[PDB]
Amino acid sequence: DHIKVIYFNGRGRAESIQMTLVAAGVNYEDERISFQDWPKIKPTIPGGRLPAVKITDNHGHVKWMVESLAIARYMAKKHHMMGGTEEEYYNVEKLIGQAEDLEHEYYKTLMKPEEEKQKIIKEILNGKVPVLLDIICESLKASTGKLAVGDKVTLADLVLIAVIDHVTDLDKEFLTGKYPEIHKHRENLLASSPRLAKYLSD
């Protein structure tokens, strides 16, 4: 059973799939597609969208998975990272929802020239971004554990760190001296998962 994570963007939507697998201690192969080869690769991907995950058993049979956060939730559920109670499940989804709202602001900046980019970044960093970071800070405070939901790793944790890194991609100093719970979350996450600590260092 061989897992291939097929994607173009190293900083993209595959991050949540890769981090789930890393934290789960699961081997996989990264297959990165270049812009140049995409037109030729597209018709070979069911649904024609990346990221996608190709799973090949030892009899050469192929199962395809599409929709990156659906894949990540499947892999997370399989390896006990989607909450241990229905209440924890709710809170996992709550924080994923909140991080996706933040991610969607980051998305407004993508594929622009110098400006719109500069103009968008400025609008989002003064608008919804700080509101959303505050909401996430309070969700983290309300955890019954040291992590986003309880004390052990969930998808909510990995989705969060990926989205924060996009925020800092826009303004590296944006969270400096602020959102201590968010910095504290990352410290704590890296402690609970040497694997992810290792992966993120590399």
Place this chain on the structure above:
Amino acid sequence: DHIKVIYFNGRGRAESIQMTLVAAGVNYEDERISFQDWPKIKPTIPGGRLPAVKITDNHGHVKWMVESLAIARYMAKKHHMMGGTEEEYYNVEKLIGQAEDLEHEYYKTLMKPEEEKQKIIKEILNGKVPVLLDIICESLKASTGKLAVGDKVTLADLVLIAVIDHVTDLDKEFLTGKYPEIHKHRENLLASSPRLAKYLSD
């Protein structure tokens, strides 16, 4: 127990919470907040965002739930509408993800001056809207049952009907003589759930 669904909106994000409860045969109270009353209501809502769900027990204890699709997933999970196996769960999340991509196109048209709204409606209906509808059609085909995932109601079913109604909101004729599996899905869904059939007329 007493469930209150607090929202704007209407044809908004509350639809998936309400449809889930309706399909689960769970009673609840709708509390609709006017634009005029929102400034005074906001500080009483944790996180200051709607939709939100206020749950009051017999002892007058108050539990708040936020993030509408996290709420919808909680309620769906509690009532066996999130798939019966891990593969069914992945497929529920797959279709939810696909419908939300469609929903995001619909969102580009909201709160616009009619000028650019007309321009946006025209832009998406020729762009990603039919691409996404085709993807959803193929997802429905791949179901092992008559509904989006298997033969029984899941959150994916309700998210799909809500989003398709938004598309027809933009162009009431867009799916006429097209996407037969989508028409077929809705045919089937109302059959499988007399409760929802009722709600969707009433």
